[PDB]
Design a binder for this molecule. Structure first.
Ligand SMILES: Nc1ncnc2c1ncn2[C@@H]1O[C@H](COP(=O)(O)OP(=O)(O)OP(O)(O)=S)[C@@H](O)[C@H]1O
Ligand SMILES: Nc1ncnc2c1ncn2[C@@H]1O[C@H](COP(=O)(O)OP(=O)(O)OP(O)(O)=S)[C@@H](O)[C@H]1O
Ligand SMILES: Nc1ncnc2c1ncn2[C@@H]1O[C@H](COP(=O)(O)OP(=O)(O)OP(O)(O)=S)[C@@H](O)[C@H]1O
Ligand SMILES: Nc1ncnc2c1ncn2[C@@H]1O[C@H](COP(=O)(O)OP(=O)(O)O)[C@@H](O)[C@H]1O
Ligand SMILES: [Mg+2]
Ligand SMILES: [Mg+2]
Ligand SMILES: [Mg+2]
Lengths: 338, 319, 328, 255, 338, 258
DNA sequence: GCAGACACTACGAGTACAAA
């Protein structure tokens, strides 16, 4: 009862964390394999790799709950994130000791109700952060002890994982969560929290999220809280969602394109300064610039080929932690010269 | 089976100083010291498998006669060679009293001496001089730079060189005659070529070829021992056209199982060791392979990145 | 358990030297070595999942018998790579005799490419001194990590990536042991996607048996393989490349977005398929190849670090379009 | 279930101390006849074969064969967590997991319950080869431990030679050499101090000093130790207990 | 003084009413609050808005701050000391004071608070841009696991440094910089209460235009004028620029006037003088680039090349420990361009 | 002595015929001082067509590897103080200097990747080329003045000390000031000067109390005052100003604060 | 039983990291 109320009053990201494997909205190609492996007891070594907010952790926390049961999961599960040191020592001392230990004794209740497979799952969240030495140490630790332990590694980028480690693990790619596949789940959450929306609000939330369900849930919760504070009783509108999602208004983007059209460095610099006097994030500006330029059919193919590469370079630099103003000005000036 | 035969490397190890083929001047000097006596402190440096341990052991045996059991002290990298061994084992061995032939003295052989700790090397400096009347220290190491200069000062520096193909051919022919192995000139030439002056590798490859296939021929030797990786790397780097180099990378390296890190590192080494290409071009290609090496070490190791590296190198060569 | 509750990668681990396929040269040469008794110091170097550990374990089983786990010193060099191990465990094992039966001793060093330089510099004389009674086996993915000295005392065997015949034979054995069927085109897709690794084919086969509604009455088609792995179908790759090459930008964007969204295809997989196909092409000028390869490498490296998927896809489209615009 | 009670809780402590240093991981297999243990060192040079019998326990009950895998270091601590004037109880459930060790003294009512997590050790060869050794000798444990500890200081290798009614222990090192020669003598007034030696063929073989120093650690169990030697066979150093024995199979060095 | 007049409640906020209303909407029901990431131009006033929101959630003792020192040990035996600014209902952590050991304080101290547990204590990460990517990846799972006890509010100036998973995990609240009108109104209230005689009111607008949206800078400049004009601002009062600004301006004059390696000598000397005196290199790069762009003599080609080289070397600096190695390269490339 | 002892065993006459081989076999390979590495690295003869054959690229990598902690810094310090002699036709000194600086920036990136949590020491040969060999080859020639030592170390230590001092003042002022470390130095310190030192410059010895007040408004100490007055640069440098306030005002200020 | 007496194990500070 206490846990039910606690989860009932928590962020909607955590309130609606999938308790079971069926609640996973669109990653069927992995949860189906896990569901059929529930019947058997031959869980492979697994590497969950995909974009953030796709559902790797939720899937791996529902799988253990279904396989072992609530009470027994604590005994048969070892979870290690990047918040814990994961050098060679914590691979050769903590992980190896956990693997060497015999499987915990299932109780009668767990055996009658839950499948209780004869192994334990080690969940390594953010395995990409681990150094190559620790992964090389884990290489044979997973192998020789596969009888009593199973290894799951969750990584945002599969390239960080060393080649033999990824070779041993079954690779599960969690697909991006666009509108088409996750609209049902978003509408489910909205209906459970009595959120009143216009026709395209949920779909628009999903498009701004760009493959991340967690961002969509956060945006929906923010919009719902704003609407409840307003007290009007109307519905959240798409423009409200765009305002709350850090999306540059179409008027300001249009003004930006008009300034790029007139190739004056001083005017572009002044408008860029005035624009950066607002917290319009440069990445969200480059995304909308790409949408406008590429989607529009009034631009030549050669111009599109050049501008796509320019936007790609700007995104690559902006994802490295540089100054947003300088990169945005460089991009706009180079498009003006185009 | 239960028992195994001796490798020809150890079975046919030279037991007298005359059997050692290469580096004639140093070996003749060691024979002259062997006959006369009074061997000074020495540091033997060179490349693997050109007879450095064997030379010092032939010298020590011939000097000490029947007293090799007590007068000679082995210390190897496999043992504990910290400052403790200098304080406790080396010092006690050097202080020991032992009656020897009039010219000969007790001998300390420190094999793999390049791995000695700085503290131990510094502590050995006074043990070398104080007890030199009774004991003579001998060092053998691949790199003479690792041994401290104060130690280098007190000893004669003998530097061994890579063995010429002729001497390797002579030694292999002698082993061929003793072991009655069937051979062809092409097979022997391939063995020397693959060994690249490393006589140890030459003998090991010869014995492996004889065991696996039974005849020393070019085909059998090349089957049991691959053609050198740096050679195919150099051929890929020095290709005239991009497509040819891509074909070499695809067929000879990627399809044959060589890992991307290996290709990039060997490309860097071949580039820095190349001579025909001018230094500026070599440096710029080195920069491109450095970028590629960073990408590979960051986890992105694919045929695409190597192909882009070759494309950049060809652009650099094509002005 | 009964070795049946284990992953197919582990349950189908070879136990005899006759169950290792692909590396027929190495297996035959090593079998002849051990039969005549002139077994040298071995260095098996090769890519992951090519069967080096299985080969050496089966060799130990053949030479020593069933009790090979007490009479062979198998050391995971990743777990213990210090010089203390060389001084204490390795040297004591090599020097002494055997507690079980008379014979020589074998030391199997797994993942010795992680061994520290001091440890290898210590072992280069442990190998030499005790060659009368012991032999050393060194397993390596990367030979550049290993010291040059340790690469001259060991006879070298390279493990090639697994060809079509051996991998196909192993799939045949697996579908015989289970109750499964594989379509010829699906088997072709499995081989193409394997990249020479039996671990990949075993894992994908287990997953494809899992995704079937019921095994032993349904077949595993190419659709099953591609969906379970998530790899792009050749038709999708060809359609995306054709749309990029010979049509306007808008429908090229439409085709890429629709192909990615409908099947959940990732961008990097599409890039790899496209670069493979374009490498299969014949191109009139070198500049096209140079620009195309360099650019796609740049987008791939940027994708590895994350970012905006749409921007990278548009960059790929523009790069291909400009590179083939150089072909006019 | 397993419920095995030692009257002398210090007995199990002493046996466990006997081979805690040699090996860390052990599989105590409890059957109806008693607890039997076999283990191999990391260097794979020494084998330890404990055989405890039913007579040792006050009350021994083993419903079905059970294997308990454990680490010697933690179990040694747990045994040291008990008083001398205590009785010990090993308790194991139907499924082997988290063995319970239970120390009681009822003279002053005190209970001490401890747990030890089991560990999955795959190696269960469980085989020894009884052989007709070339020589069988028996000497007091104190004398043999004294000799081994004093010859270990000269070198790391100790050579044992068995000849016609002669036992020789040699140690040649860098600071010098040493050699002790003993003869088999039978003493009527005090039987425990006698030396027995039955030889079929003279033996000459060497051991390492560290392993001998670790074997002689079992001298606290029995007052007399037997040594079985043979030509290229694992030397048998046996300490006979009241109900069973503790035997070290050592592998001699190669000439 | 800026300290003399700082809003202490949401109802006292005077600029960007939209943000104020959004903060009251979030504070309406505080039992359901996702983690926050405030971002925008420096000097906007985001920290004050965080404090006002915190005051609306908890009681008005949120401003009773106390400094405490918590000693920690790193991977080596070296000892680090962090001063934690704390309140009965919240705490503040600024990783930027440490170097690469920030992960430690992120992984231990935060978790400690989670072990300790108006059921949540807010932790304010004042400097999250300086947070190492490894430290952010360590905070990644602490963010989700302990969401019922710890709720983060992270203050930022640029979102680009922060990795994607963190941005996904927290609600993004933009802070637009106040336009010149609200800055002028605040300055008018300040001069009214501080009794600064004003010849006219155009001085306040000039100060607003000379600060580029910064309210801290505007108020401090107002005080600096009041200390040079005897608390009586005149029409011709020269605007006080901080020392580093004049140094960068003189560096720009030297660069444009003297395009020689001998001039590069003095440019490196000036850069060393700036760097050794507690000035970040990225800010120097930004100011120098914009000052170079503002010089009238150069043609558009030179300005475009300058912005391109500035972007490239800004990326280089973002991926480089030694700051001067990239700043001198930027200056040399600019001098070569001219 | 040992050379003669060893060589005289076989060859009884050491003359001009064999001296070359004796030198080539017995030459001492001593790690050069960083000044010598800088001198040889920035030498025109080394990177010429003829000189490259005598001193191969591998030898230049070895020169870097002699001291891998200072040669990158020495080259960075003394690559702009040389008269070049390998300028390509159509290139000035400034272009070569800019290319060298770009290469040093790339080498700094490589060094950070080498010397960070990833510890990619396998890039050490690459860091040899990008940081030292390539820029020196770009600006190779004669040494114009003297070879100076790396100034980066001293200014880095100075920056660390000033950062520490700024941390103390910032944490002292934290309870009032809503800022970060950098913002304080950027904005407040220029204003803090006008309220701390300028009253001593203008109104006189009666400013102490007022100064003390603002001091006590932010928990500043006398050491804090001395530290704040040491952070200004360029026009607003206070080192000469603090000398020109008469000693009476200083003594009264310290006495009143105490 | 109670106190030292070497001897083993745990802790802490310093240094080097490549290629041939
Ligand atoms: N497939 C999904 N179905 C339903 N809800 C989901 C799904 N994926 C994400 N969510 C929601 O988003 C929250 C976070 O999901 P996570 O599994 O932690 O995302 P993630 O894959 O771990 O991303 P990381 O940890 O940054 S790599 C969950 O608690 C759900 O509320
Ligand atoms: N010059 C030589 N003449 C004859 N056999 C040689 C010669 N050089 C090497 N060998 C063979 O190679 C084996 C190894 O010789 P060593 O001297 O031990 O090698 P090394 O030169 O000391 O290099 P290491 O051992 O890697 S430091 C010898 O036992 C011979 O079989
Ligand atoms: N040649 C082969 N024949 C049959 N099965 C194979 C073969 N190679 C790999 N496998 C399968 O793949 C599994 C892994 O084999 P391993 O030998 O452990 O891989 P590896 O060669 O050691 O590569 P590593 O461990 O990454 S260095 C085996 O248990 C088999 O199921
Ligand atoms: N509504 C407001 N009224 C008065 N002053 C404000 C207001 N908003 C911001 N400020 C001023 O802005 C200054 C700096 O704000 P701060 O929160 O430190 O910015 P940041 O956190 O972005 O660095 C404060 O000194 C404060 O006086
Ligand atoms: Mg997660
Ligand atoms: Mg040698
Ligand atoms: Mg393996």
């Amino acid at each position: 009862l206490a846990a039910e109320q606690s989860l009932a009053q928590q962020p909607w990201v955590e309130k609606y964390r999938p308790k079971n494997l069926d609640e996973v909205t669109a990653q069927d190609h992995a949860v189906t394999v896990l569901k059929k492996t529930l019947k058997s007891a031959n869980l492979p070594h697994m590497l969950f790799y995909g974009p953030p907010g796709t559902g790797k952790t939720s899937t791996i926390l529902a799988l253990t709950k279904e396989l072992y049961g609530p009470d027994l999961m604590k005994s048969r599960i070892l979870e290690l994130n990047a918040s814990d040191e994961r050098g060679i020592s914590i691979v050769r001392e903590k992980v190896k000791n956990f693997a060497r230990l015999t499987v915990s004794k299932p109780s009668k209740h767990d055996l009658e109700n839950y499948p209780c497979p004869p192994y334990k799952i080690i969940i390594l969240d953010e395995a990409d952060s681990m150094t190559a030495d620790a992964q090389s140490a884990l290489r044979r630790t997973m192998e020789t002890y596969s009888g009593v332990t199973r290894f799951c590694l969750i990584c945002n980028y599969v390239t960080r994982i060393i080649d033999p480690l990824a070779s041993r693990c079954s690779k599960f790619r969690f697909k991006a969560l666009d509108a088409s596949n996750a609209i049902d789940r978003l509408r489910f959450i909205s209906e459970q929290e009595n959120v009143k929306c216009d026709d395209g609000v949920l779909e628009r939330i999903l498009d701004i999220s760009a493959g991340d369900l967690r961002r969509g849930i956060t945006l929906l919760q923010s919009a719902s809280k704003g609407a409840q504070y307003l007290g009007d009783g109307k519905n959240i509108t798409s423009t409200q969602v765009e305002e709350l999602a850090g999306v540059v208004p179409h008027d300001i983007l249009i003004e930006i394109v008009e300034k790029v059209k007139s190739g004056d460095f001083d005017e572009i610099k002044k408008y860029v300064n005035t624009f950066m006097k607002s917290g319009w994030s440069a990445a969200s500006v480059v995304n909308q610039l790409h949408e406008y330029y590429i989607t529009n059919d009034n631009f030549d193919t050669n111009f599109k080929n050049q501008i796509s590469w320019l936007l790609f370079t700007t995104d690559s630099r902006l994802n490295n932690g540089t100054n947003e103003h300088i990169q945005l000005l460089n991009l706009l000036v180079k498009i003006s010269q185009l | 089976t239960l028992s195994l035969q001796l490798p020809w490397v150890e079975k046919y190890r030279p037991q007298v100083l005359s059997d050692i083929v290469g580096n004639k001047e140093t070996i003749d000097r060691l024979q002259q010291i062997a006959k006369d006596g009074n061997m000074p402190h020495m540091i033997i440096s060179g490349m693997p498998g050109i007879g450095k341990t064997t030379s010092v052991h032939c010298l020590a045996h011939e000097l000490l006669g029947r007293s090799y059991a007590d007068g000679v002290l082995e210390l190897n990298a496999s043992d504990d060679r910290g400052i403790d061994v200098v304080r406790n084992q080396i010092k006690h061995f050097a202080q020991k009293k032992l009656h020897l032939p009039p010219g000969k003295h007790k001998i300390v052989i420190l094999d793999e001496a390049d791995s000695m700790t700085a503290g131990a090397q510094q502590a050995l400096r006074r043990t070398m001089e104080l007890y030199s009347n009774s004991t003579r220290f001998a060092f053998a190491c691949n790199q003479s730079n690792k041994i401290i200069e104060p130690l280098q000062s007190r000893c004669a520096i003998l530097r061994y060189s890579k063995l010429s193909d002729e001497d390797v051919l002579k030694r292999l022919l002698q082993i061929i005659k003793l072991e009655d192995v069937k051979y062809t000139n092409d097979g022997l030439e391939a063995i020397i070529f693959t060994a690249e002056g490393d006589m140890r590798q030459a003998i090991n490859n010869l014995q492996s070829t004889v065991a696996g296939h039974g005849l020393v021929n070019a085909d059998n030797v090349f089957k049991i021992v691959d053609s050198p990786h740096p050679l195919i790397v150099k051929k890929m780097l020095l290709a005239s056209n991009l497509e040819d180099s891509i074909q070499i990378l695809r067929t000879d390296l990627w399809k044959k199982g060589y890992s991307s890190i290996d290709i990039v590192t060997t490309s860097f080494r071949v580039t820095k060791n190349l001579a025909q290409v001018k230094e500026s071009v070599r440096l710029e290609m080195i920069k491109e392979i450095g970028l590629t090496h960073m990408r590979i070490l960051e986890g992105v190791g694919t045929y695409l990145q190597l192909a882009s590296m070759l494309a950049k190198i060809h652009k650099l060569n094509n002005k | 358990r009964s070795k049946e509750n284990l992953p197919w990668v582990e349950k189908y681990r070879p136990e005899t030297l006759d169950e290792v396929y692909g590396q027929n040269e190495v297996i035959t040469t090593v079998r002849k070595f051990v039969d005549e008794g002139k077994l040298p110091h071995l260095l098996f170097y090769g890519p992951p999942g090519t069967g080096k550990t299985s080969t050496i374990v089966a060799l130990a089983r053949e030479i020593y018998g069933k009790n090979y786990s007490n009479m062979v010193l198998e050391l995971n060099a990743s777990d213990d790579r210090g010089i203390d191990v060389v001084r204490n465990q390795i040297k004591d094992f090599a020097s002494t005799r055997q507690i079980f039966s008379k014979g020589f001793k074998l030391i199997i060093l797994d993942e010795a490419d992680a061994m520290t330089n001091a440890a290898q510099n210590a072992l280069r004389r442990v190998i030499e001194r005790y060659t009368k009674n012991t032999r050393f086996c060194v397993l390596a993915n990367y030979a550049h990590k290993l010291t040059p000295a340790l690469l001259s005392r060991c006879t070298r065997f390279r493990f090639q990536p697994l060809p079509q015949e051996a991998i196909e034979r192993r799939i045949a054995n697996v579908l015989v042991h289970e109750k499964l069927k594989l379509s010829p085109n699906a088997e072709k897709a499995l081989i193409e996607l394997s990249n020479g690794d039996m671990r990949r084919v075993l894992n994908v086969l287990q997953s494809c048996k899992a995704t079937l509604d019921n095994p032993d009455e349904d077949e595993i088609s190419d659709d099953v393989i591609y969906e379970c792995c998530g790899a792009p179908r050749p038709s999708d790759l060809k359609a995306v490349l054709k749309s990029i090459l010979e049509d306007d930008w808008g429908t090229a964007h439409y085709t890429l977005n629709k192909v990615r969204s409908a099947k959940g295809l990732a961008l990097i997989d599409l890039i790899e398929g496209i670069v493979k196909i374009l490498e299969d092409y014949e191109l009139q000028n070198e500049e096209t190849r140079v620009h195309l390869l360099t650019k796609l490498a740049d987008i791939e490296y940027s994708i590895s670090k994350g970012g905006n998927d749409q921007i990278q896809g548009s960059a790929v489209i523009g790069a291909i379009k400009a590179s083939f615009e150089n072909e006019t | 279930m397993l419920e095995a009670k030692f009257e002398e809780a210090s007995l199990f402590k002493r046996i466990i101390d006997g081979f805690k240093d040699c090996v860390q991981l052990v599989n105590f297999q409890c059957k109806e006849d008693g607890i039997i243990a076999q283990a191999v060192d990391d260097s794979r040079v020494l084998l330890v074969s404990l055989e405890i019998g039913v007579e040792a326990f006050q009350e021994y009950r083993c419903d079905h064969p059970v294997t308990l895998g454990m680490d010697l270091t933690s179990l040694s601590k747990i045994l040291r967590c008990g008083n001398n004037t205590d009785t010990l109880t090993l308790i194991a459930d139907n499924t082997p997991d988290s063995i319970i060790l239970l120390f009681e003294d009822t003279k002053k009512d005190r209970i001490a319950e401890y747990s030890l997590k089991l560990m999955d050790i795959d190696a269960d060869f469980l085989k020894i080869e009884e052989l007709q050794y070339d020589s069988t000798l028996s000497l007091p444990s104190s004398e043999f431990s004294k000799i081994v500890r004093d010859l270990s200081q000269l070198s790391d290798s100790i050579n044992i030679m068995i000849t016609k009614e002669t036992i020789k222990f040699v140690a040649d090192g860098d600071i010098g050499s040493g050699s002790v020669i003993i003869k088999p003598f039978v003493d009527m007034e005090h039987p425990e101090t006698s030396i027995k030696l039955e030889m079929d063929q003279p033996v000459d073989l060497t051991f390492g000093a560290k392993y001998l120093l670790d074997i002689i650690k079992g001298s606290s169990l029995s007052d007399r130790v037997g040594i079985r030697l043979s030509s290229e066979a694992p030397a048998l150093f046996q300490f006979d207990l009241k109900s069973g024995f503790l035997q070290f199979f050592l592998a001699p060095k190669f000439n | 003084w800026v300290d003399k007049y700082r809003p202490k409640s949401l109802n006292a906020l005077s600029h960007n009413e939209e943000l104020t209303n959004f903060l009251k909407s979030l504070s309406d029901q505080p039992r359901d609050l996702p983690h926050l990431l405030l971002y925008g131009p420096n000097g906007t006033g985001k920290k004050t808005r965080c404090m006002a929101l915190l005051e609306s959630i908890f009681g008005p003792g949120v401003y009773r701050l106390k400094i405490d020192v918590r000693q920690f040990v790193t991977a080596s035996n070296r000892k680090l000391e962090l001063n934690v600014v704390s309140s009965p209902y919240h705490l503040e952590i600024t990783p930027s004071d440490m170097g690469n050991n920030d992960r430690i304080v992120i992984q231990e101290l935060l978790k400690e608070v989670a072990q300790m547990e108006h059921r949540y204590k807010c932790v304010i990460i004042n400097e999250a841009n300086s947070l190492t990517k490894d430290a952010q990846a360590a905070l990644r799972r602490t963010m989700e696991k302990y969401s019922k006890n710890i709720r983060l509010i992270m203050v930022c100036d640029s979102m680009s440094p922060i990795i994607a998973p963190i941005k996904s995990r927290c609600l993004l609240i933009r802070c637009p910089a106040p336009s010149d009108s609200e800055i002028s109104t605040i300055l008018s209230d300040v001069v009214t209460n501080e009794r600064i005689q004003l010849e006219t009111k155009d001085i306040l607008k000039r100060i607003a235009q000379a600060s580029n949206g910064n309210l801290r800078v505007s108020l401090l400049m107002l005080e600096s004028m009041a200390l040079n004009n005897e608390l009586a601002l005149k029409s011709s009062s020269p605007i006080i620029k901080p020392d580093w600004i004049i140094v960068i301006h003189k560096l720009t004059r030297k660069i444009v006037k003297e395009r020689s390696v001998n001039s590069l000598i003095e440019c490196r000397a000036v850069l060393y003088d700036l760097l050794a005196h507690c000035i970040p290199a990225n800010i120097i790069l930004k100011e120098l680039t914009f000052s170079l762009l503002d010089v009238e003599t150069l043609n558009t080609t030179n300005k475009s090349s300058i912005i391109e080289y500035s972007s490239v070397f800004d990326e280089r600096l973002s991926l480089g420990n030694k700051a001067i190695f990239h700043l001198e390269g930027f200056i040399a490339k600019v001098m070569c361009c001219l | 002595i040992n050379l003669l002892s060893t060589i005289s065993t076989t060859t009884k006459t050491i003359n001009h015929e064999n001296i070359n081989e004796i030198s080539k076999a017995w030459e001492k390979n001593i790690a050069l001082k960083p000044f010598d590495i800088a001198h040889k690295m920035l030498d025109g003869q080394i990177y010429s067509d003829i000189g490259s054959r005598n001193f191969t690229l591998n030898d230049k990598i070895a020169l870097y590897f002699d001291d891998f902690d200072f040669t990158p810094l020495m080259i960075q310090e003394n690559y702009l103080s040389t008269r070049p002699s390998v300028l390509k036709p159509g290139q000035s000194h400034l272009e070569a200097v800019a290319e060298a600086a770009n290469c040093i920036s790339l080498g700094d990136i490589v060094e950070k990747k080498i010397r960070s949590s990833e510890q990619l020491w396998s890039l050490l040969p690459l860091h040899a080329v990008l940081s030292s060999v390539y820029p020196a080859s770009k600006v190779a020639g004669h040494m114009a003045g003297r070879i100076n030592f790396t100034a980066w170390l001293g200014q880095n230590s100075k920056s660390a000390k000033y950062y520490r001092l700024l941390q103390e003042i910032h944490y002292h002022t934290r309870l009032g000031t809503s800022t970060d470390k950098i913002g304080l130095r950027l904005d407040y310190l220029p204003t803090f000067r006008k309220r701390l030192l300028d009253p001593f410059l203008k109104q006189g010895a009666d400013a102490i109390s007022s100064v003390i007040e603002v001091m006590d408004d932010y928990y500043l100490t006398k050491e804090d005052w001395d530290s704040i007055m040491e952070f200004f640069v360029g026009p607003d440098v206070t080192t000469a100003i603090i000398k020109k306030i008469p000693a009476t005002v200083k003594s009264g200020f310290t006495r009143k604060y105490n």
